[PDB]
Amino acid sequence: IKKKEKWGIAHIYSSYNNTIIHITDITGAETISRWSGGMVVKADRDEPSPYAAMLAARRAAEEALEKGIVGVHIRVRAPGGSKSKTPGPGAQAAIRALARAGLKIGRVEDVTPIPHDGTRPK
Amino acid sequence: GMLIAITGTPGVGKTTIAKLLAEKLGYEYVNLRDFALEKGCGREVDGEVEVEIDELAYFVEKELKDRNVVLDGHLSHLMPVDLVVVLRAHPRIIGERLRERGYSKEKIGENVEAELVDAILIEAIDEHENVIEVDTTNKTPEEIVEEIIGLIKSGVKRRVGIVDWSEVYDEIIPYLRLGG
Ligand SMILES: Nc1ncnc2c1ncn2[C@@H]1O[C@H](COP(=O)(O)OP(=O)(O)O)[C@@H](O)[C@H]1O
Ligand SMILES: [Mg+2]
Ligand SMILES: [Mg+2]
């Protein structure tokens, strides 16, 4: 029997002002690592930057690996406009940074939240 | 005419603020959902109302043109208005309020996340140049309305980027959808 590995979930949030990478275990009850753009960069104006997203993802991935996480499934929240739907390069940049740090990448799902109740659009 | 849209994540206080503001401004309050029902765009099925947005924009443009109106709804920023006001609140507040409304755990979670990632704000900025963001946290409706009228009278047509909820992320973890 050849089988191994411990997998987590990387919750990735791309907002207007920032990026968050929150890594949990598969159950989602335990927090493995939590990093945002605001934690890795000095200036407010650089917090939304995809470079900051990559750096935060790098820190998160390192922390997760040291705690024994071999790979992660990704759950992405990447809001974009209603006119032009532009999520931005940030979430993808974060995912790539997770891979480059040595994490395996599993399923990638876009869970981007849609506010609802009131009138219902199509 | 002056058409002002009041939008934001469900639970943030759109209706409260819109009514108080319309009264204090001497404008007329219009709830977008009900308006959608009147023009026959909206169809109500058990109990949600489905509409086609382009039609609603068409009717809003047509009927209200021409008027002084405070428009209340989370779709209001998708309408052809003169000014958009986006209300923000600490996502925990959203969670508690929607929790009191009886929403499902998943629905609460999605709307709380929606506030976390600034979804409505991003939509509004994509749709309009004139967007005023207002943080409702630890404020009374009175203070919020006077803040809004104050900014309009300044006048300021655009203010955005005033909240970053990533800083409060841990506090909202119990409401989020993290489950495997
Ligand atoms: N500034 C505020 N301070 C305290 N409570 C508020 C405030 N604004 C709204 N609320 C409360 O929050 C709840 C939801 O407000 P509501 O206007 O229905 O939000 P929305 O219209 O965005 O769904 C109401 O029960 C209301 O009493
Ligand atoms: Mg409302
Ligand atoms: Mg900040």
Author numbering:
A (entry chain H): 8 to 129
B (entry chain G): 0 to 179
Sentences from the paper on this structure:
Amongst the factors involved in this maturation step, Fap7 is unusual, as it both interacts with ribosomal protein Rps14 and harbors adenylate kinase activity, a function not usually associated with ribonucleoprotein assembly. Fap7 forms a complex with Rps14 that is conserved between humans, yeast, and archea. We report that Fap7 association blocks the RNA binding surface of Rps14 and, conversely, Rps14 binding inhibits adenylate kinase activity of Fap7. In addition, the affinity of Fap7 for Rps14 is higher with bound ADP, whereas ATP hydrolysis dissociates the complex. These results suggest that Fap7 chaperones Rps14 assembly into pre-40S particles via RNA mimicry in an ATP-dependent manner.
Two crystal forms were obtained for the archaeal aFap7–aRps14 complex bound to ADP/Mg2+ and ATP/Mg2+, which diffracted to 2.1 Å and 2.4 Å, respectively. In the ATP-bound crystal form, two copies of aFap7 are bound by ATP and two others by ADP. The structures of the ATP- and ADP-bound complexes showed only small, local conformational differences in the actual ATP binding site. The base, ribose, α, and β phosphates of ATP superpose perfectly on those of ADP, and the residues of the P-loop are in the same conformation in both structures. However, the presence of the γ phosphate of ATP is not compatible with the position of Arg100 (LID domain) in the ADP-bound state. This arginine, involved in binding the α and β phosphate oxygen atoms in the ADP-bound structure, bridges the α and γ ATP phosphate oxygens. Compared to the ADP-bound structure, the γ phosphate pushes Arg100 away by approximately 1 Å. This effectively distorts the structure of the α5–α6 loop of the LID domain with a 0.9 Å r.m.s.d. compared to the ADP-bound conformation for residues 89–107. Interestingly, the conformational change in the LID domain modifies the positions of Tyr102 and Lys106 side chains, which interact with the Rps14-CE Asp124. In the Apo-hFap7 structure, Arg100 would clash with the ADP phosphates, and the LID domain is even more distorted. This suggests that the LID domain undergoes major conformational rearrangements upon nucleotide binding and/or release and that Arg100 could sense the ATP binding pocket occupation state and relay this signal to the Rps14 binding interface through the LID domain residues Tyr102 and Lys106.
